[PDB]
Ligand binder design. Structure first.
Ligand SMILES: Cc1cn([C@H]2C[C@H](OP(=O)(O)O)[C@@H](COP(=O)(O)O)O2)c(=O)[nH]c1=O
Ligand SMILES: [Ca+2]
Length: 129
């Protein structure tokens, strides 16, 4: 896998964000995670966390996996990095996202995120509280 550039356009919620990628606006859906909807318990906290992480970053990157790069809704499917730190992993590690939507051939960082989930659950953080 390879990191590619992108620039924040707008935070949307815990697991979607609008980025400019190859000079075009795109909505991205974070691979391998599920945040609560804003509507839902810890939804606003997940959204805030993503937003702060992305907005505070000097450099956003996107990293596609080996399989499909867009979903059925035309969202890009990627791992997103903020100043080299994976947003997908960070949400999971803080108990603000569950590992979810693990489809074969876009699951390169599954075990990394599962480990983060186990640590969050051990610490009874947020969703695991
Ligand atoms: C994360 C992810 C979601 N999706 C689709 C599956 C779900 O379909 P449905 O909309 O039919 O439920 C939806 C979940 O996204 P959200 O969690 O943003 O709603 O996005 C993929 O197809 N591939 C993926 O990697
Ligand atoms: Ca969601």
């Amino acid at each position: 896998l390879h990191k590619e550039p992108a620039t924040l356009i707008k935070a949307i919620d815990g697991d979607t964000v609008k980025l400019m990628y190859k000079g075009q606006p795109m909505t991205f859906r974070l691979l391998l995670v599920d945040t609560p909807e804003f509507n839902e318990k810890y939804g606003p906290e997940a959204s805030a966390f993503e937003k702060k992480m992305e907005e505070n970053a000097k450099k956003i990157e996107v990293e596609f996996d080996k399989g499909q790069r867009t979903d059925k809704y035309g969202r890009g499917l990627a791992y997103i990095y903020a100043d080299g730190k994976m947003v997908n992993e960070a949400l999971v590690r803080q108990g603000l996202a569950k590992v979810a939507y693990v489809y074969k051939g876009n699951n390169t960082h599954e075990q990394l995120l599962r480990k983060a989930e186990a640590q969050a659950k051990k610490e009874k953080l947020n969703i695991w509280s």
